[PDB]
DNA sequence: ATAAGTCACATGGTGCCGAGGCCGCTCAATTGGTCGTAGACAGCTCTAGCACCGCTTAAACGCACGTACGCGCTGTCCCCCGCGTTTTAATATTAGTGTATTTGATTTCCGAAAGTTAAAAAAGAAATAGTAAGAAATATATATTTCATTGAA
């Protein structure tokens, strides 16, 4: 779930009958609109570890050598 | 006779404090207006529950008889109370921790409210099957006829 804000959907704060706290929003999923979710603040992970693996090769061939 | 100087004397004026009066600020209470809404009021037509009466009889009252249980008497036995003397925790006094409720603040939740809108359904008509009564089909028992056979006119 990864809930760290516990703050309601800003577009959904208008009619805040429920708040499922799901990403992007349970109310938006009921509403079927992800674009409206992006318009608000509203507080993708498998590429960071491979890039860190790649960093070791980068700093050896740029900073140390070259 | 008078200008100038002395001495006291009576009053003018300026200043902070005290007491009374007015005013503004705020909060609560009260009342009038207003308008959506509901209740009183006629008004009408309909169910519907008494008055009567016949009647048929199930039920009820009355008189007489008796015996099944209510109570009274008398024994005999168990059976809580009454003291007397030991035991034993209730109980009031501090007290300390560690829960356990309560109050503000807030912030995210949940349903009253209003407006459309579609489904459940209610009434009425038609189909159809259940059931009872009637008529026909038929199986069966019995009389009747006819022929054969064997004994009488």
């Amino acid at each position: 779930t990864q809930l760290k804000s516990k703050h309601p959907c800003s577009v959904c704060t208008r009619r805040k009958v429920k708040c499922d706290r799901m990403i992007p929003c349970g109310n938006c999923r009921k509403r079927g609109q992800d674009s409206e979710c992006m318009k608000s603040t509203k507080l993708s992970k498998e590429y960071l570890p491979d890039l860190l693996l790649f960093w070791q090769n980068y700093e050896y061939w740029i900073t140390n050598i070259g």
Side-chain angles (χ1 to χ4, degrees), chain A residues 29 43 61:
Chain A
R29 183 48 57 175
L43 73 164
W61 269 113

Side-chain angles (χ1 to χ4, degrees), chain A residues 18-52:
Chain A
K18 293 293 155 258
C19 200
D20 215 6
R21 305 296 200 209
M22 162 56 48
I23 189 70
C25 190
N27 200 359
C28 286
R29 183 48 57 175
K30 185 69 171 63
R31 196 67 179 86
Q33 278 154 20
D34 207 1
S35 309
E36 267 79 14
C37 174
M38 187 66 204
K39 301 289 116 177
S40 159
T41 66
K42 255 80 160 184
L43 73 164
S44 66
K45 297 296 166 298
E46 66 182 1
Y47 73 99
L48 63 94
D50 291 331
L51 273 161
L52 292 186

